[PDB]
């Protein structure tokens, strides 16, 4: 029912989910006062993506869609936003078990079962335009980290699972964006063609799904969308911002069989530039960051359908507790804010950092 032509971000308004709002209102605001407290309330109204990082999270997707249907009945013209993120052997670059499913233990079949639940929900809510980011930090690893055994070994499963997801969720009311890393990852000249080739193959191998509108970039990262001066940590890379990245890989996708591919770029933590990153590859709770460009389709650039907030600012990227099961050394680096909770959990000091260094400002 909620069909569309062209940019799926035009004609609708991204829904600011209750999940994130609860975090800010119940875990953050009670700790703030005056200006900060009032500004914080505003942050909760900015639409961000809901991550379906576990099967147990799927019922939350239906609830969100239920809320949206109710709102749309009242003049609402809202669209849901979700991230498909539960591949077996997820985040293959990290040694420890990151997700609930593993290839060795029927992971691929379990992934398909996971996708089946999501399809049924989307079919039931075909009246709601659904914008999805497909598996962040998966395909990019296949381009650069095959040197890591866990990734090399996961290649086959990743491609089969992603194909299932893209074909099963190829519905009239859906717009999918395949995660494509970011400028400091696949933006480097040397990685551009191999990346473009892989993405185009995924598209074609899925029979050029109508719903697969393009690629998502900078998900959970901090690059600027259009900064004018190269940060020191970008040394050597001419593609030092997301705009440069999408303009470099876009034509290449076409050369490899994928025309009319558009993009969406995360700017949820890109507001302060340069960042406090001492190394471009440092991705955990980076210090010196702020909320960035607000979600909007008025990008002024043909290739970008919209600025978006995929990674919800305030939700931790990983714990700094060295004895924690999924501890990652990247979260204990000097350019990473500490002490930090487990991935996904609320990290108050980080939320305050983002709010404080926000541009546009909330204060």
Ligand X SMILES: *[C@H]1O[C@H](CO)[C@@H](O)[C@H](O)[C@@H]1O
Ligand Y SMILES: *[C@@H]1O[C@H](CO)[C@@H](O)[C@H](O)[C@H]1NC(C)=O
Contacts with ligand Y by CB under 6 A lie at: 159-160, 163, 201-202, 205, 225-226, 228, 293, 300
Residue 155 CB, nearest approach to ligand X (Å): 34
C-beta closer to ligand Y: residue 134 or 293: 293
Q: Please, are residues 233 and 258 in contact by the beta-carbon 8 Å criterion?
A: no
Listed in sequence order, the DSSP H helices in the chain are: 18-22, 34-43, 58-73, 107-124, 139-144, 149-168, 189-205, 242-255, 348-356
Q: Please, are residues 83 and 50 in contact by the beta-carbon 8 Å criterion?
A: yes
Taking CB atoms within 8 Å and a gap of at least 24, the contacts of 56-60 are 58/114, 58/117, 58/118, 58/121, 60/19
Q: Which of residues 300-359 bind ligand X (CB under 6 A)?
A: 348
C-beta closer to Co ion: residue 62 or 67: 62
Sign (positive/negative) of CA torsion 92, 97, 98, 103? positive
Strands 78-84 and 212-217: unpaired
Residue 226 CB, nearest approach to ligand Y (Å): 4
Residue 133 CB, nearest approach to Co ion (Å): 23
Q: Please, are residues 4 and 175 in contact by the beta-carbon 8 Å criterion?
A: yes
Q: Which of residues 59-88 bind Co ion (CB under 5 A)?
A: 62
Strands 130-134 and 212-217: unpaired
Task: Note whether 22 binds ligand X by CB under 6 A.
Answer: yes
159 binds, among ligand X, Co ion, ligand Y, none (CB under 5 to 8 A by kind): ligand Y
C-beta closer to ligand X: residue 280 or 291: 291
Q: Which of residues 29-68 bind ligand X (CB under 6 A)?
A: 31, 34-35, 37-38, 41, 44-45
Interface pick for ligand X out of 6, 59, 70, 77 (rule CB under 6 A): 77
C-beta closer to ligand Y: residue 27 or 159: 159
C-beta closer to ligand Y: residue 160 or 321: 160
Q: Please, are residues 351 and 333 in contact by the beta-carbon 8 Å criterion?
A: no
41 binds, among ligand X, ligand Y, Co ion, none (CB under 5 to 8 A by kind): ligand X
Give the number of residues written for the chain.
363
- For residues 116 and 120, give the distance between their C-alpha atoms in angstroms, rounded to a whole number: 6
26 binds, among Co ion, ligand Y, ligand X, none (CB under 5 to 8 A by kind): ligand X
45 binds, among ligand Y, ligand X, Co ion, none (CB under 5 to 8 A by kind): ligand X
Active site residue 56: no
Catalytic residue among 137, 266, 282, 328: 137
Q: Please, are residues 143 and 195 in contact by the beta-carbon 8 Å criterion?
A: yes
Closest by alpha carbon to 136, among 171, 178, 187, 78? 178
C-beta closer to Co ion: residue 113 or 229: 113
Closest by alpha carbon to 76, among 122, 21, 15, 154? 15
338 binds, among ligand Y, ligand X, Co ion, none (CB under 5 to 8 A by kind): none
CA distances to 198, 235, 285, 297 from 222, in Å: 24, 16, 10, 20
Residue 134 CB, nearest approach to ligand Y (Å): 13
Q: Which of residues 7-46 bind Co ion (CB under 5 A)?
A: none
Give the total of residues touching ligand X (CB under 6 A): 22
Q: What are phi and psi of 308, to 5 degrees?
A: -145, 165
Active site residues: 137
Contacts to ligand X by CB under 6 A:
3-5, 13, 19, 21-27, 31, 34-35, 37-38, 41, 44-45, 77, 348
Contacts to Co ion by CB under 5 A:
62
């Amino acid at each position: 029912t909620a069909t569309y032509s062209g940019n799926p971000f035009v004609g609708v308004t991204p829904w600011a989910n209750a999940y994130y709002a609860s975090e800010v209102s119940s875990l953050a605001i009670p700790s703030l006062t005056g200006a900060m407290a009032t500004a914080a309330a505003a942050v909760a109204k900015v639409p961000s993506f809901m991550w379906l990082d576990t099967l147990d999270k799927t019922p939350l997707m239906e609830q969100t869609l239920a809320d949206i249907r109710t709102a749309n009945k009242n003049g609402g013209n809202y669209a849901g936003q979700f991230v498909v993120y539960d591949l077996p052997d997820r985040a293959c670059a990290a040694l420890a078990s990151n997700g609930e499913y593993s290839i060795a233990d029927g992971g691929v079949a379990k992934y398909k079962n996971y996708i089946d639940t999501i399809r049924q929900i989307v079919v039931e809510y075909s009246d709601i335009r659904t914008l999805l980011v497909i598996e962040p930090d998966s395909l990019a690893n296949l381009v650069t980290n095959l040197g890591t055994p866990k990734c090399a070994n996961a290649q086959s499963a990743y491609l089969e699972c992603i194909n299932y997801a893209v074909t099963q969720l190829n519905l009239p009311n859906v717009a999918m964006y395949l995660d494509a890393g970011h400028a400091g990852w696949l933006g480097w000249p040397a990685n551009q063609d191999p990346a473009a080739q892989l993405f185009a193959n995924v598209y074609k191998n899925a029979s050029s799904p109508r719903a697969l509108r393009g690629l998502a970039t900078n998900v959970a990262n901090y690059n600027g969308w259009n900064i004018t001066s190269p940060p020191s940590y970008t040394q050597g890379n001419a593609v030092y911002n997301e705009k440069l990245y999408i303009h470099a890989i876009g034509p290449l996708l076409a050369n490899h069989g994928w025309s009319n591919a558009f993009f969406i770029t995360d700017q949820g933590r890109s507001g302060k530039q340069p960042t406090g990153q001492q190394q471009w590859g440092d991705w955990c709770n980076v210090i010196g960051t702020g909320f960035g460009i607000r979600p909007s389709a008025n990008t002024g650039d043909s290739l970008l359908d919209s600025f978006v907030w995929v990674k919800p600012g305030g939700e931790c990227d990983g714990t700094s507790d060295s004895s924690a099961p999924r501890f990652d050394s990247h979260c204990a680096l000097p350019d990473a804010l500490q002490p930090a909770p487990q991935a996904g959990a609320w990290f108050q000091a980080y939320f305050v950092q983002l709010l404080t260094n926000a541009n546009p400002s909330f204060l």
